[PDB]
């Protein structure tokens, strides 16, 4: 009975468009809203077999594909399509999640869902609903697979102070079901870089950075002794912090029309690679990271340099990633370029901190391809120029301290560098 | 007059500074194990050895900084003093911790200092609040690196202004580490006192 009801009631959404907004469009919108409300009501407080679930999912997919397949109009901005889609996307996603967690779903239906969602990636409301559902799934995954509550955490307290979908017969939230569900829902939009509208790309990547931040918070909160009397061994299961890097590396080579997306991707990758790494990354990943960082640092837009320097403390140098010598020269050049500019919004403090952090590398890293004497001369010239030109007191103080550290290093190693006297003169005049 | 003369003689005649030095081994993230260490790595011992000579507390006539003659608080401690500045380190790897009362005494001695040199070889970043203490406005943290290099990170209270010749995130070699760390700690103590 309910199967034939939904099959017969699917026609209300397939109703013809109306040219009269005040009455015909309003009535059609109200009827479709009532139908989707009763669909949402029945999707939660009722039980059904797999055939009913498949029929409901097919009906929802067909309705979404039919009512939202009119992109040929630009001057016409009827509220009908967006008004329906705003609720339709949420209903479709919730129904899909419930069906997947309740009964088995064939892979053909999954492929059809992926295709119909990828072909309709030009709507911002879809992006917002995907972000919200991903947040909810991530909260569920954190609560289930890792035994960590998102509402209250040991770090938060310190601040205050087999599954059926997996081929079994168990229904509910389980580590097997939640993991695969979260992994599959992540790629519903498909390859993000295929998105055309730059605003949509920026929104998706901002939400991706927020997602990575939540994952990092969960990872940091793990393995904490509540009693402060015995340090537990690290768990065998850790959140996958560096999983989105494949999207970021491709998003970094997009043309200039996606500048905001490139900035967000740079911020995300820089914040990702600047923390402690539980497992050593593979050689190919390191090659890709070095290539993208080299391309970013030697760019021309000042915003790229500002974003890549403002979020890259020398902790990246401290991590000791293999083969990071070329980054020394690239960072020196980037710091010189950013400090040459006199814009007051530039990250002067971070720039001078990065510049002074490398002050001891050339002496200990003799005969580095990226000459040692030439690199030292360039670095000391930049330091001397900064110590007498920085308009910000914090940057000037850091520059003076770095110059003093350089003098101490030169004296200790007994280089007999003629530039030492000039640095002493600079200190004396100060 | 006798009481006033005794009180005047009690006051020091130089600049006195009190510094706490900790130690962290791999896999330690709790107060009990961090305060129960009785020895450190070779690099840590060399670094502490570069902060001043050793003085026998039994027959030491200089500054004490809360230490006791009976040997309960330890038998040796590093000592560095000049014509006008005198600094004594409360190294946590020299004070015996074989009993709970010893742990309480060590905690109440180290928690009264305003500068902490928190050496850390741990695989995870140091977190504020591991060792409870009312004081501790400056916490210099050292993370060893490859090729004998070292990493220095400084966390300070917002009220404390810029004080040290070692900026946050500075990277120094092994030779410069003791002198720079000692000078930074002295300057931090001066800033905290002037606060």
């Amino acid at each position: 009975l309910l199967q034939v009801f939904l099959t017969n009631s699917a026609n209300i959404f397939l109703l013809e468009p109306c040219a009269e907004v005040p009455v015909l469009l309003k009535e059609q919108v109200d009827a479709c809203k009532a139908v989707l409300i009763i669909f949402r009501r029945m999707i939660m407080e009722l039980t059904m077999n797999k055939k009913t679930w498949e029929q409901m999912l097919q009906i929802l997919l067909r309705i979404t594909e039919a009512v939202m397949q009119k992109p040929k109009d630009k001057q016409i901005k009827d509220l009908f399509a967006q008004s329906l889609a705003g609720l339709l996307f949420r209903t479709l996603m919730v129904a899909w999640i419930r069906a997947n967690l309740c009964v088995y779903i064939s892979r053909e239906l999954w492929d059809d869902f992926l295709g119909v969602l990828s072909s309709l990636t030009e709507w911002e409301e879809l992006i917002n609903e995907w972000a919200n559902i991903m947040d909810s799934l991530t909260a569920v995954l954190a609560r289930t697979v890792y035994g960590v509550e998102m509402t209250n955490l040991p770090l938060d307290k310190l601040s205050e102070q087999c599954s059926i979908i997996a081929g079994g017969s168990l229904t509910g939230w389980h580590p097997d079901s939640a993991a695969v569900l979260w992994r599959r829902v992540l790629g519903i939009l498909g390859d993000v870089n295929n998105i055309q509208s730059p605003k949509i790309h920026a929104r998706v990547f901002c939400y991706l950075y927020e997602l990575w931040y939540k994952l990092a918070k969960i990872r940091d909160n793990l393995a904490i002794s509540l009693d402060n009397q015995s340090s537990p061994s690290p768990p065998v299961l850790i959140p996958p912090l560096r999983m989105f890097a494949s999207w970021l590396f491709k998003a970094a080579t997009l043309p200039n029309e996606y500048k905001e997306g490139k900035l967000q991707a740079y911020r995300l990758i820089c914040a990702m690679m600047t923390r402690r790494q539980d497992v050593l990354p593979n050689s190919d990943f390191l090659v890709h990271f070095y290539l993208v960082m080299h391309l970013g640092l030697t760019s021309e837009d000042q915003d790229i340099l500002n974003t890549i320097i403002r979020h890259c403390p020398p902790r990246f140098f401290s991590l000791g990633f293999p083969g990071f010598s070329m980054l020394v020269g690239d960072f020196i050049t980037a710091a010189a370029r950013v400090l040459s500019t006199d814009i007051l919004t530039a990250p002067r403090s971070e720039a001078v901190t990065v510049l002074g952090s490398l002050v001891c590398f050339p002496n200990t890293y003799q005969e580095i391809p990226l000459g040692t004497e030439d690199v030292k001369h360039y670095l000391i010239n930049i330091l001397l120029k900064n110590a007498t030109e920085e308009p910000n007191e914090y940057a000037r103080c850091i520059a003076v301290c770095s110059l003093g550290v350089w003098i101490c290093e030169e004296l200790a190693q007994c280089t007999s560098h003629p530039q030492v006297k000039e640095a002493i003169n600079v200190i004396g005049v100060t | 007059l006798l009481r006033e003369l005794k009180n005047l003689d009690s006051r020091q005649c130089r600049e006195t500074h009190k510094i706490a030095v900790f130690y962290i081994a791999e896999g330690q993230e709790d107060k009990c194990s961090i305060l129960s260490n009785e020895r450190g790595s070779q690099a840590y011992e060399d670094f502490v050895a570069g902060l001043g000579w050793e003085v026998d507390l039994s027959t030491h006539c200089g500054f004490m900084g809360g230490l006791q003659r009976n040997g309960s608080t330890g038998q040796t401690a590093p000592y560095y003093a000049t014509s006008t500045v005198e600094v004594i380190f409360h190294v946590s790897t020299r004070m015996p911790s074989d009993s709970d009362d010893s742990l309480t005494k060590k905690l109440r001695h180290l928690g009264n200092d305003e500068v902490h040199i928190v050496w850390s070889e741990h695989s995870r970043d140091y977190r504020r609040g591991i060792i409870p203490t009312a004081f501790g406005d400056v916490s210099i943290i050292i993370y060893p690196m490859k090729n004998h290099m070292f990493f220095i990170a400084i966390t300070k209270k917002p009220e404390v202004p810029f004080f040290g010749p070692l900026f946050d995130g500075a990277i120094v070699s092994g030779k410069l580490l003791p002198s720079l760390v000692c000078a930074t700690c002295i300057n931090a103590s001066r800033a905290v006192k002037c606060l």
Binding site: P391, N392, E393, R396 | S83, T84
Partner: peptide, 24 residues
Amino acid sequence: VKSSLELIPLTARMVMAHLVNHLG
């Protein structure tokens, strides 16, 4: 960049006394 005895006499007296006494 964008930006009660007097201490100096006492400091001068202390420095002179220290230099006279402890130098060498």
